[PDB]
Amino acid sequence: SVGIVYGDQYRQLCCSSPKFGDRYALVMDLINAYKLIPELSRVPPLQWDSPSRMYEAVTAFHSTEYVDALKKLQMLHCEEKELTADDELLMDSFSLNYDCPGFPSVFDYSLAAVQGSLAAASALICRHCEVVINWGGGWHHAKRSEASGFCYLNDIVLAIHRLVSSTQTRVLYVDLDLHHGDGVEEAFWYSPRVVTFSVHHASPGFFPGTGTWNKLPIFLNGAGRGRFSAFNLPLEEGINDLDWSNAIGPILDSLNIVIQPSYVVVQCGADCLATDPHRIFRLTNFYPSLSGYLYAIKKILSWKVPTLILGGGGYNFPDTARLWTRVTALTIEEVKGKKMTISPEIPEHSYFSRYGPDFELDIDYFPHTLDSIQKHHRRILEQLRNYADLNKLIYDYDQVYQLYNLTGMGSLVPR
Amino acid sequence: SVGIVYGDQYRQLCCSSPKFGDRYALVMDLINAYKLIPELSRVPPLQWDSPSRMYEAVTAFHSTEYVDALKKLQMLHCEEKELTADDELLMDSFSLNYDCPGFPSVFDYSLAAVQGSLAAASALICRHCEVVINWGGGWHHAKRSEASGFCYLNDIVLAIHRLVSSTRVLYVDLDLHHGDGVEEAFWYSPRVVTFSVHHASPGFFPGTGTWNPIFLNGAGRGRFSAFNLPLEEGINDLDWSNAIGPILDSLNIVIQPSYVVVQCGADCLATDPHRIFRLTNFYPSLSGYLYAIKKILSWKVPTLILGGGGYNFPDTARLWTRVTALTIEEVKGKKMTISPEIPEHSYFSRYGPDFELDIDYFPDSIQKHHRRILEQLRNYADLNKLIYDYDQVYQLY
Amino acid sequence: SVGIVYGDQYRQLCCSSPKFGDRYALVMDLINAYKLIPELSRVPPLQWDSPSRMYEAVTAFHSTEYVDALKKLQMLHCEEKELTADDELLMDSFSLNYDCPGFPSVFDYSLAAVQGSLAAASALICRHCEVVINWGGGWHHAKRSEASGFCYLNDIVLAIHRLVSSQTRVLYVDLDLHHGDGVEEAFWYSPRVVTFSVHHASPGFFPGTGTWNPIFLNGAGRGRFSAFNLPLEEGINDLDWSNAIGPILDSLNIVIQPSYVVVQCGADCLATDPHRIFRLTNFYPLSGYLYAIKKILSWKVPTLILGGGGYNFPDTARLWTRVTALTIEEVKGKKMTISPEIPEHSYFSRYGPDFELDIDYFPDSIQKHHRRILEQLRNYADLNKLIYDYDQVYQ
Amino acid sequence: SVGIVYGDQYRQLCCSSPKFGDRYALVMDLINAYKLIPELSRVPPLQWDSPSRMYEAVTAFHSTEYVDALKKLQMLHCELTADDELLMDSFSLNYDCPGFPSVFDYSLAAVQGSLAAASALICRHCEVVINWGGGWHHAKRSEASGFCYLNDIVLAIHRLVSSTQTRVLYVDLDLHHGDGVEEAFWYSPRVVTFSVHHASPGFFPGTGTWNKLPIFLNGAGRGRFSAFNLPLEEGINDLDWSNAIGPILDSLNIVIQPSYVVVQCGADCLATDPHRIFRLTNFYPLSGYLYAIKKILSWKVPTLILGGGGYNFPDTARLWTRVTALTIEEVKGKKMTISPEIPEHSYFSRYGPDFELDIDYFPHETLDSIQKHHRRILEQLRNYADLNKLIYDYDQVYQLYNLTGMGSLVPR
């Protein structure tokens, strides 16, 4: 059973932010126009029995004071009058400004992603779905008491918290977004049962600045009982589908062999696409060379582990919809063993005109030694050996070796 | 609203240099130990959407090859290998050597201050704040293609170039050293008037900002637009205040600036290891710096306050804590009571052995300069068709 | 109409190189001796408003540091002194050495072909001409940052890039003795520019590509199956060459339906070329060159005709004069009667000792290549969702 | 007496081309708005008594067939066959020199103004005459070029140089090499041409620079050494450009002793021209233009001043309005004070956002000097004197260059 989070008020709320506009509607309507919706079990967003139980949900991670401020910020923007000087200072103390502005639905918008991702986690826990997709979720930058990068509430941390708290349970979190998932990584920095792994761009001045090097420089990788449980693969700009795929594949499989997660949570932000306005990575949604996204999603799904698939970044809205519609059809193929054929021409529906000038499903893009990252593979596998050692897990050197030996790189695997 | 630039990562990068060590952490911890942070609006450092975007922002002043050299220098110092002869040559052609050495975070360190001062300028432009403080910035010696005086990227030039493009800007440089990089950058520009007061003497860094014999003061349309007041060693709070006060008043009258940018280098302090001037951080005579910031703040012009020099780190923290409280008093009106005793906190033991907020100090050529400077202001107002009562301004001296 | 690139400055620049000498003058002056210029529209070479504009045009394909190196190489050869060891290393790193030497005008000479071929692309685009000829152009071996085969700037790539950015699909046909690797390489990832080169290929023969690699490479990414090659053994004649390429040209037209055709017409396949590899002629009773040009022109697609190789200068002039007259005839519908004797003119002595227009010459593997190429065409059209009658093509 | 070519029909024709639009109207109206017109003697464009007299005037330089084709192109646009297309392309009546309804009247008008201006110099009615509708220096005998269809400079110089020992000095300040004027007089020693310009690979028109060590061609036959060229790299400012041509101009005046000077004063060297090559200004406290014009007028030689290029139309008018006031000042000895604010007139709105007379530009600065060109040029000047049997006043030329410290560059 493949689940997906949708609902009438859920779509209105998801589409009510100044930065993301109607992106969620495009995604779900393109999925709908390709007739995928009948294949999928609709997962209704969680609702609560009182503000108290809701406040209790959100404050499992977020400070009560930051939640109150996020609520006040919404009420303020729904009245005509301006913020007082004290209002200003309180919002700034929570970074409720600049790149995380207030707007009339900012709290309802932020809560909706939490409702969706918590409901998604619950459908996995009680084994109603093997996989659940939430294209309204994935806000990986939000901190305990800080908004960041248009992330006001961290649905991912809250969904993971519910998975680990369900009745030796380990979660593997995989962050494919163009940006470092600092918010998820920071929340579980001291926790061995949530192993985070983000692949991303990092360069000086690039948001948010972490997920890379810090006497020679070093990678911090978690602390205390969490030492070695935070993994990062920072990559230079310009990477294509094959090199990104080759970069994370063996790492993904090695993490799965050693962590043995009970659940996998995948943040699947689409700003790595070549046609994203960031213009940094050069990934595609192509499907016969092959989209590194689809390659990674197919590999994770092959592990047969209950999985949550989340959205995230993606600022070319039509191309984000093209990629996540393919990710959704792939998930249906892999889980249900059911062939999903997707016509190259965008079907008739009410957002058809946004897919111009081509109205095709492939993004409108033409892909065209020394850039290798074998010392990162070696660093990360030694980190994996340390994690297994510190947590007294089996480390199957032979299985990890054979994997990397498929690409002639067994010599990077430590014993 | 008074803004102050800070962040976790930004504090980490400002404290990673060999020459300024942990000074920014002491400054921001004394400000916080005095409960000033709740009064202040946190301004986060600017971040960019791509490498191309950051490069576009920095080569708005610096040359691309100088930026590549500086980033190359960081990568080399993040390896264990010694530089090749060819790479020593490349770094030497950009003065990335001697007093501007490489170190493992030299590029992130340099850029952090640009991020800090660019965000501060943006906050003033969209009118989020009336004043912004950035104690991690103020690197006034860097040139387009050249490090100098431990300044690798000129965050002041970039911030001024952002304000003057949103309009005249008055730049005020209180540092012991001449602000030559800022003055050079706007040498041909009438809409950025620069005014530096400083020590100058034969062989004293950087060597400019004095008689050259006659005084140079801008070129092209920017003629008469760079102002300089050099002073002999030994000057105290009151004489320094009296030498600078009338010049500040006359520039504001005649120029009518849209923004004021103040470099507030703390190496004029009597306890700085340069031991050249005798300024204090006393708020009752009155500190030269506090007198100056208060006057500039009296103008109600949106103002950037930046750091700079200052090599006695606890006394720089003592000076800039008072400047921060004063800015809060003058902008919000909210009286600021600072205990004379250093509050307990992480760095409390650095403020030994006395743990007082006051620094531990026991306290004609200028008239000829005033004559010449007023003549140059008159010349500037002439050339730029500005309207001013030459008699009200003449009365200021 | 039919356009031809020329100009006095252009002619002086195109004749300033050590390797092709005054070939361009022989070409253009045989064309004039035969009273063909009044039938042709003169296309002046493009000129730019500033150094920056010239640089923006040329670095559409070439790297800036390569353009910088090329202009520095010209300056150095206008000085008396030797190059420094460091300057030699610099030029080596862009292969500005050996068969791509410096000389006093190497940059102005190279750029002139770009000026002519861009002006010719533009005359096609605004529709002033149906066909344009540039016998000073056709330097198909230059790469993004590398001279090769006396090609310093790839004028074809820049012309083709101007035509595709004017949905536009361009067919490039390369009849030169050598594989057009630079043009092929430039559009390796692009399905909108389909490249077809026929050439000699054999072990050790320049530049090495355009043949079994074993299998044939033919493009990558969305350009897969979009680079076509027909390598041929030495000694082939007009009729075997014609039968070899004739069906491939027709099939490419039917299936790609190109918006423009760009034809490189290097004359080093001639029997009398000092390469002495192919046995093609300039005979119009039939010259393989005239057969292919006439086939290509019968398609009525706006067409760019370019020069290229050709190292027997009077015999290249004989072929290119016949190509020009034929293009006039095929386009305007108006017979062009060319005397079998060379008319008198400034360069008449070069055509001795017989002074005649005909060049002085007495005149299954391919089935495997046709089946390979027909299958690759099918893969191309299928990958590009182009509609076409497979059976009509296979005939 | 300073003359200026103007007339009602003349304004209309000069304003009727697609490429230059109303540029001539902004120029003359700004001169008018600064009140310079009463100081100037209006010089009416020349008219002829028949088509044949007109055609005789124009074919003193241009071929019969090129003029005939140019007339046809204008008649054609007032209503093309494939042979009309071929005919026009044989004269480069295409691309950068297209046809338009008035292309012949437009082209003829500049001839009419420059010849009338020459005539006013010849008969001593004026010491100097300005024509801002003229200066089309690229047009060839049988070829339109660079939006020049008829070469009014060539025809004007030919009238001067044949009026009753007579030599003309032609000075071309335009951004571009004056190829059309240089080619016309290439075999003639009595018209000495000097062009300063940008030249670089691919920049129009390509001549006026280097051509075994490369060489400068400089005339042929009796005209050997009579064509001077100074090509400059991009970025030159008012002072470097002033120092580059000042001494060459003074030396040319000293050695050649011209009876008339003709100055093409094309404005595309302005920093604000769309070409963005040179960084000249119109500033006047110093503009290289105003510097060079002041220097030429100080020789007290009857002088014709022509327009040319200039594709920022308000800034072209700001330059040429200053050139006009300075000519009045230098020739009549009469102070011409021009206010910094553009005066009120129908085109006032075209000088925004500043509405000031100084162009809106901010200037800002061994190995970029051109002292070898001075040496090459002074040697060519000495060769011209020899060939033509003129006195070469070494001491005066030397004293001239030793003002800068460069006497050592002067040949004996």
Ligand SMILES: Cc1ccc(C(=O)NO)cc1NC(=O)c1ccccc1
């Ligand atoms: C500023 C920022 C911060 C965070 C994220 C993000 O998606 N993180 O996962 C994205 C952004 N990017 C943007 O807001 C953006 C939008 C359009 C063009 C370029 C950039």
Ligand SMILES: Cc1ccc(C(=O)NO)cc1NC(=O)c1ccccc1
């Ligand atoms: C060498 C130098 C260069 C520039 C600046 C400066 O602060 N410029 O604004 C300061 C210095 N001074 C010093 O670095 C210094 C440090 C400790 C004791 C004495 C001097």
Ligand SMILES: Cc1ccc(C(=O)NO)cc1NC(=O)c1ccccc1
């Ligand atoms: C070495 C080379 C490289 C490229 C090309 C060429 O024409 N490519 O299109 C031709 C050559 N051939 C020659 O340069 C050559 C010249 C004369 C006699 C024999 C050979």
Ligand SMILES: Cc1ccc(C(=O)NO)cc1NC(=O)c1ccccc1
């Ligand atoms: C193509 C041309 C040809 C000749 C001349 C010229 O002024 N010669 O004196 C000028 C040009 N320049 C231009 O036509 C031009 C116009 C506007 C912007 C950029 C360029």
Ligand SMILES: [K+]
């Ligand atoms: K990521």
Ligand SMILES: [K+]
């Ligand atoms: K963890």
Ligand SMILES: [K+]
């Ligand atoms: K100072």
Ligand SMILES: [K+]
């Ligand atoms: K200035």
Ligand SMILES: [K+]
């Ligand atoms: K070929």
Ligand SMILES: [K+]
């Ligand atoms: K191709």
Ligand SMILES: [K+]
């Ligand atoms: K000129």
Ligand SMILES: [K+]
């Ligand atoms: K001459």
Ligand SMILES: [Zn+2]
């Ligand atoms: Zn992102």
Ligand SMILES: [Zn+2]
């Ligand atoms: Zn200092």
Ligand SMILES: [Zn+2]
């Ligand atoms: Zn060849």
Ligand SMILES: [Zn+2]
């Ligand atoms: Zn010009």
